[PDB]
Amino acid sequence: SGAIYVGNYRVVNRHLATHNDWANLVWEDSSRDLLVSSTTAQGCDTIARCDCQTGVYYCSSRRKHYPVSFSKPSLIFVEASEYYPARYQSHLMLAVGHSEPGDCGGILRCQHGVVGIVSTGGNGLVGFADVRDLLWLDEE
Ligand SMILES: CSc1ccncc1NS(=O)(=O)N1CCC[C@H](C(N)=O)C1
Ligand SMILES: [Zn+2]
């Protein structure tokens, strides 16, 4: 579990969105595993606007933040899970690191701010849904 709180927005994995998230929906995209809802209080996270390929992510299954090297956002095949059928997920970055299903939502960050959230994994890999292209998270 986990979310990004920037401005009056809450960014979560689409597959983990609550009924309150859907009832206050701003934008969702199943191909990216992302959903954004509106919030009453202002959040403290800042979004990175950069092309870093190194950063640090939070792994809840280890209670630890790990430094990682990650690939550029791409279209990657993701196997069938209890949340989606086998499909191509877009804007996904891969890294070598520990992950378990419940680790989804952990933040990946660089020196500039939040880069994305854990979305996929398995066998010593972890995948992150990038958010750096969503410029509208910084306004309105
Ligand atoms: C951190 S997710 C994870 C980690 C380790 N083993 C396995 C997994 N699970 S998964 O990769 O099948 N995942 C399950 C939840 C939905 C995800 C999606 N974005 O399509 C796919
Ligand atoms: Zn950066």
Give the method used. X-ray
Owning domain of residue 131:
45-140
Cα–Cα distance, 43 to 54 (Å, whole number)? 24
Supply 12's token pair: 């979560």
* C-alpha span between 134 and 69 (Å, rounded): 22
Does 53 share its domain with 112? yes
Same domain for 30 and 56 = no
Residue 48: C-alpha distances to residues 100, 107, 115, 127 (Å)? 25, 12, 5, 18
One domain, residues 23 and 77:
no
Task: Kindly give the distance from the C-alpha atom of residue 22 to the centroid of ligand 2, in angstroms, as a whole number.
Answer: 30
Q: From CA 2, how far away is CA 5, in angstroms rounded? A: 10
How many angstroms separate the Cα of 73 from the Cα of each of 91, 94, 129, 133? 4, 8, 8, 10
Of 99, 128, 127, residue with least CA distance to 116 = 128
Ligand 1 pocket test target in 79, 81, 103 with most atoms within 8 Å of CB: 81
59 annotated to a ligand binding site = no
Q: Please name the residue whose Cα sits nearest to atom 18 of ligand 1.
A: 120
Same domain, 40 and 85: no
Residues 30 and 70 in one domain: no
Considering every ligand atom shown, identify the ligand nearest to the alpha carbon of residue 103 and give its number.
Answer: 1
- Backbone break loci in the chain, preceding residues, C–N > 2.5 A: none
Residues 34 and 51 in one domain: no
Residue bearing tokens 């997920």: 89
Q: Count how many domains the chain has.
A: 2
Q: Are residues 38 and 83 in the same domain?
A: no
